[PDB]
């Protein structure tokens, strides 16, 4: 079974977590049809989504909301998840005690699934998860010892083999917990392996709607980790997932004629140009942020699932 019982303690003051949550044109505490947007490593909410799912979800009738855990999602993924759990608790009540969708970019999907695995209270408040290029198994690429002996906390945790990805898998987290759609690409340049269109892929969750773009669009279709979020093909799949009465994208709703890798048609020209410039700023933030030579310790609620892995304090024990 999954973790059950009481939610783990928060390490951050609630006022700090509240400060990281914003909704466009509304208060999180009094908001119609919120969608919670969870950014990837090296970005804020607006930086991840201003060129894409903030305007696109608004045009579908949601109030776009986001968390921006400081600094730029570079801190410990477990602390980033506190922002999401707090945001879910708030948006659920602030929308009349109604479940809400969560939509994530890159490592924001790891944040979401970590929260669902280890914070039982939110499972009944999230109606579906729409994850673009999620790194549930981390990635084998680049890495925390590349070009400097120190790397950001969440960069350590997103590395395949990390104590965090280990603990997520051993606790049951590579199976979907709420209805989940995972849109990803075999040509993802941040996250590998993604090529097999099978559970080997880092974005795959058992029983989820796992959509590798090349399985629909052809072996030669190319979108990177950002295009995975912003492309017109991505918009059609995400719109399906958000509208579906099953909580997952439906194969009937998308097909080879939607295989357009450029930014979603309904974005403004300015939004389309910004959608093409997402790589460099996130990479530079990763370079300028907090850095360390070890993976953050697992919090007690996750330690028993990665016994034997090495974190800053030493060997994980249960």
UniProtKB/Swiss-Prot annotation:
Task: Extract the InterPro entries matched here.
Answer: AB_hydrolase_fold, Stereospecific_Lipase
Keyword list (alphabetical) reads: Cleavage on pair of basic residues, Disulfide bond, Glycoprotein, Hydrolase, Lipid degradation, Lipid metabolism, Signal, Zymogen
Question: Known EC number(s)?
Answer: 3.1.1.3
Q: Catalytic positions?
A: 106, 188, 225
GO BP field: lipid catabolic process
Query: Which sites carry carbohydrate?
Result: 75
MF GO annotations: triacylglycerol lipase activity
Catalytic activity, reaction form: a triacylglycerol + H2O = a diacylglycerol + a fatty acid + H(+)
Disulphides: 23-65, 217-259, 294-312
Q: What does this protein do?
A: Hydrolysis of triglycerides. Is very stereospecific both in hydrolysis and in organic synthesis and has a potentially important application in glucolipid synthesis.
Q: What is the name attached to this protein's record?
A: Lipase B
From what organism does this protein derive? Pseudozyma antarctica
